[PDB]
Amino acid sequence: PITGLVYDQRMMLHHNMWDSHHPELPQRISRIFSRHEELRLLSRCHRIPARLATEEELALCHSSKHISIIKSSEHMKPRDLNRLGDEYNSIFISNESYTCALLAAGSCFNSAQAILTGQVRNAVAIVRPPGHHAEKDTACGFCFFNTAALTARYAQSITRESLRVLIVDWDVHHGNGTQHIFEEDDSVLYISLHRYEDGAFFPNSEDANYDKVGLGKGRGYNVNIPWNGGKMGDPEYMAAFHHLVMPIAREFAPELVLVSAGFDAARGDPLGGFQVTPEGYAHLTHQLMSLAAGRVLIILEGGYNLTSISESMSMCTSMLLGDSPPSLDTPLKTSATVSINNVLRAHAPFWSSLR
Numbered sequence: 060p061i062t063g064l065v066y067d068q069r070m071m072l073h074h075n076m077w078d079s080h081h082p083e084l085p086q087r088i089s090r091i092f093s094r095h096e097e098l099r100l101l102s103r104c105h106r107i108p109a110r111l112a113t114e115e116e117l118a119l120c121h122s123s124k125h126i127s128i129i130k131s132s133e134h135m136k137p138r139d140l141n142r143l144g145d146e147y148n149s150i151f152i153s154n155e156s157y158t159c160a161l162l163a164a165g166s167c168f169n170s171a172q173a174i175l176t177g178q179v180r181n182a183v184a185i186v187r188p189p190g191h192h193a194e195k196d197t198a199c200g201f202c203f204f205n206t207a208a209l210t211a212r213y214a215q216s217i218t219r220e221s222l223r224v225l226i227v228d229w230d231v232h233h234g235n236g237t238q239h240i241f242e243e244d245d246s247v248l249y250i251s252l253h254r255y256e257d258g259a260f261f262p263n264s265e266d267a268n269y270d271k272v273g274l275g276k277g278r279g280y281n282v283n284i285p286w287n288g289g290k291m292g293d294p295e296y297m298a299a300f301h302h303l304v305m306p307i308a309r310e311f312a313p314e315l316v317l318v319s320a321g322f323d324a325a326r327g328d329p330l331g332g333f334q335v336t337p338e339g340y341a342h343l344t345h346q347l348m349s350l351a352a353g354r355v356l357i358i359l360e361g362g363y364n365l366t367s368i369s370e371s372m373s374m375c376t377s378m379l380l381g382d383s384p385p386s387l388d389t390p391l392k393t394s395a396t397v398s399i400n401n402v403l404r405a406h407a408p409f410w411s412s413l414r
C-alpha cells in the first residue's frame with residue numbers, strides 16, 4: 060500500500076451531552092470510514108494504528124496549564140464539565156473528550172512517522188475532535204489540541220529541527236491556532252483558505268486577513284487567503300491554488316505536507332455555505348501530492364454534511380492511492396479575484412515566484 064489510513068471508532072466517544080444535535084457529531088468519522096469500506100479503498104490502504112499522544116508531546120505546542128485543565132475534565136462531574144465548556148468560545152466537553160483529543164493527535168503522529176520512515180508514501184487520518192482552532196493556551200471552536208501543529212513539531216522532533224513543513228488548511232474556517240503557533244517560524248509554512256466576510260465569520264478576527272504575513276523570521280511564511288461576499292467553489296479554489304498556493308509551496312520546497320482537511324467548504328455543508336465539490340477536493344489533493352516527494356498527510360478537521368464529507372474525503376484518499384483525478388464541471392467571482400490579488404500584493408515581496 061502506498062497510502063496509510065488511521066481510524067479508531069473510540070474517537071466517536073467525544074459527544075455533547077446537553078445539545079445532542081451539535082453539528083460536530085460522533086458519526087462524522089464513522090460515515091467517512093464506512094464510505095471507504097464500500098468504495099473498496101480501505102483494503103487498498105495500510106492500516107496505521109491509533110495511539111494516545113503523551114503529555115510531553117502535547118507540550119510541543121501547548122502550555123502546561125492548558126494541558127492540565129483539559130486533562131482534569133476526565134473525571135469531572137457534569138456540572139463541572141458544563142462550566143468548563145462555557146469558559147471557551149464554542150466548546151463542549153465530556154469525560155471522553157480528553158482521550159479522544161489524545162487519540163486524534165497520536166493517530167497523526169503515527170501517520171507522520173509512517174510517512175517519514177518510508178512505511179507509506181502518504182496517509183489519511185479520519186480523526187475527531189478537530190484541532191486547528193486550538194491555541195497554545197486555550198481551546199476554541201470544537202478544538203482542544205492543535206493536531207496539525209503538534210504533528211509538524213513531532214515530525215521535526217524525529218528528523219531535524221529545521222524540517223520544512225507545509226500546512227495547508229482548506230477548512231472553511233481560519234486556523235487561528237495554527238497561525239499563531241507558527242507565526243514567528245520560517246520552518247513551518249501555513250497557508251489557509253477561509254471564508255472571511257471582512258472579519259464577520261468564525262473565529263471573527265482580523266488575524267485571518269491577507270495582510271497578516273508572519274512575524275520576524277516568519278515574515279512571508281503565513282499566507283491567509285480570505286473569501287468575502289460570495290459562495291466560493293471549485294473555480295475560486297482552483298484559481299487560488301494556481302496563482303498562490305502552489306507557486307509559494309513550490310518555492311518553499313516542503314519536506315512534509317500536512318493538510319488541515321476540513322470539508323465544511325463542501326457543497327451541502329450547513330455551516331460553511333460554500334460549494335466545493337468532491338471532485339474539487341480531489342483536484343486540490345492531486346496538486347499537493349506533487350510536493351514534498353509525495354509525503355502528504357490528510358487530517359480531518361471540520362465538515363458537517365455527513366454525505367458531503369464521506370464523498371469528499373474518500374475522493375482525497377482515492378487520489379492518494381494514485382487514481383486519476385475526475386473531470387471538473389463557472390467564471391471566478393469578482394470578490395474572489397479581488398481576494399487573490401490582495402494576497403499576491405501582500406506576499407510578492409517575500410516570494411520571487413509571485414513576481
Ligand SMILES: O=C(CS)NCCCCCn1ccc2cc(Cl)c(Cl)cc21
Pocket residue numbers: 081082149189192200201230232261321323330360361362
Ligand atoms: O467548525 C469549526 C471547526 S473546523 N469551527 C466553527 C466554529 C463555530 C462556532 C459558532 N457557530 C457557527 C455556526 C454554528 C452552528 C452551531 Cl449549531 C453551533 Cl452550536 C455553533 C456555531
Ligand SMILES: [K+]
Pocket residue numbers: 228229230231232233234251252253
Ligand atoms: K482554513
Ligand SMILES: [K+]
Pocket residue numbers: 241242243244245247248249273277280281
Ligand atoms: K509560519
Ligand SMILES: [Zn+2]
Pocket residue numbers: 230231232321323360361362
Ligand atoms: Zn471548519
